[PDB]
Amino acid sequence: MKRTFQPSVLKRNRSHGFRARMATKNGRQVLARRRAKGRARLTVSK
Template sequence: MPKRTYQPKRIPRQRKLGFMARMSSRGGVRVIRSRRRKGRWKLTV
């Protein structure tokens, strides 16, 4: 039986999807902005 594909780890997740990672690119800034506008309780992971 093969291993499941999703093996969660906190640090890689933060590096890829965290706030600082989002703010480092133009597209990520747009993501944050749209989530703020929508009123999301959590902006990033």
């Protein structure tokens, strides 16, 4: 059966990548939060 995760790198980067996050103020608050938590990987960006 077809499952929910059907990977595509272009769609991954367009939807959640670093530059998509930087494009809006709400996305920059995601990055601010993850930096404050100290995540080793800020985004999906490979």
